[PDB]
Design a protein around this ligand. Sequence first.
Ligand SMILES: NCc1ccc(Br)cc1
Length: 246
Amino acid sequence: IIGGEFTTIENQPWFAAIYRRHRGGSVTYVCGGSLISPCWVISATHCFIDYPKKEDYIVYLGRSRLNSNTQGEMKFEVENLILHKDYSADTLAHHNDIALLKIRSKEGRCAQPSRTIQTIALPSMYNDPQFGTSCEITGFGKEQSTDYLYPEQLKMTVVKLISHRECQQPHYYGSEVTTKMLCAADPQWKTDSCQGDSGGPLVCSLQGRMTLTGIVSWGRGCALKDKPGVYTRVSHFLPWIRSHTK
Ligand SMILES: NCc1ccc(Br)cc1
């Protein structure tokens, strides 16, 4: 996350931290995700397309730090890694960039709510907030596009949903942005998601409830003028989600 502030998992208790196991025994961070039910984490297909075996991944919930332990955290294995059949990537854009991870503990349990772990609501079919609405994004991604390290503490920031009309303009992304996506950015372009924030939540208040409106997908750089963050539009994937969550 570029700009914004350091936070803790209690302020974003649906946030899932996804890592990959490495030969040589190293484990490194992959992407964010969101807990949409006790057994299911939603994320972005692009995080996993290169290495699609579930056995390689580990999901933490309740985790406020990247490479050290948080009290109350819970470790899970990936019982089912579901990537979208129609995923494809442009030079810039990714399409149908959505994924599901079915989680279970080695002891076989799914997630139990606590001070640091909660599910997040899906939006109702085709129901998104209006443009100009303020939403929050969260992640362990880079603090500056040029950095080589990820921050050790979880960050969040606030961005504003931008109209399709406006995200169409050729000084933005043009044809590359579609109706399966949402755009969001800072009015002054000073804060944004960045590399490593992919798969994480874009959270908006909807019917007096924190709702998972977007999934961090792609952008031109991070926090660059006229290049807002692009997000998978969750409200247009409910059939995919309901079907594959059975
Ligand atoms: N795919 C990494 C990335 C995602 C969002 C923005 Br904005 C920038 C980069």
